[PDB]
Design a binder for this molecule. Sequence first.
Ligand SMILES: [Zn+2]
Ligand SMILES: [Zn+2]
Ligand SMILES: [Zn+2]
Ligand SMILES: [Zn+2]
Lengths: 113, 111
Amino acid sequence: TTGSTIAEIRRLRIEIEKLQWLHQQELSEMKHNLELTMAEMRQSLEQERDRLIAEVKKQLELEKQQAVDETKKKQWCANCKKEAIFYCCWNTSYCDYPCQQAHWPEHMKSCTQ
Amino acid sequence: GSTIAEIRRLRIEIEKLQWLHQQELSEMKHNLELTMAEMRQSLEQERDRLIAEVKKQLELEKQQAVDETKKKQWCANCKKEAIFYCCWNTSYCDYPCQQAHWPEHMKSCTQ
Ligand SMILES: [Zn+2]
Ligand SMILES: [Zn+2]
Ligand SMILES: [Zn+2]
Ligand SMILES: [Zn+2]
């Protein structure tokens, strides 16, 4: 029947028309939410970078102070900068006799005792 | 054949195309999320690289500090720079430090 086919076609066409109007609000709010999550991620990553750098600097500054202080407690070879075991005169110590011999031409200029 | 059946077939195919389109929109939404996760991971890796450079430079400052310290004598009492010495590895910045330190240093001394 002609009228019944026309009504069925018309019904389908109307359903397609309703399909067109769908999902506009979702996509248009999706871009704006993308901007906000992107900005929040950039800010959080920047704060985490600053926190990590500050922490690494604090820890290595403490490690440096510990190394310097440990170093002040010992005597160091004036020729090779390894730990020394005997001394010639003020602020001139050596780890073995060959370092003393090697360093003598320079140390001779300013030696005592 | 049946016209209404043929239309109903058409509806099924259109609804299927519509569901597919929906799958495309949500797979692109997912891909956008993966791209964001990839951006976070790549930025984190670059931060780790920067941190490694900062550690490399701070470790050099540590070594220079150590090497500088090896060049001087340090007060056995207060750890400031020393100007005279009592015996091996025992120097002082001033006489008041030497005096203050004598009760502990006496057990180990030369002169
Ligand atoms: Zn040496
Ligand atoms: Zn000497
Ligand atoms: Zn002192
Ligand atoms: Zn002494």
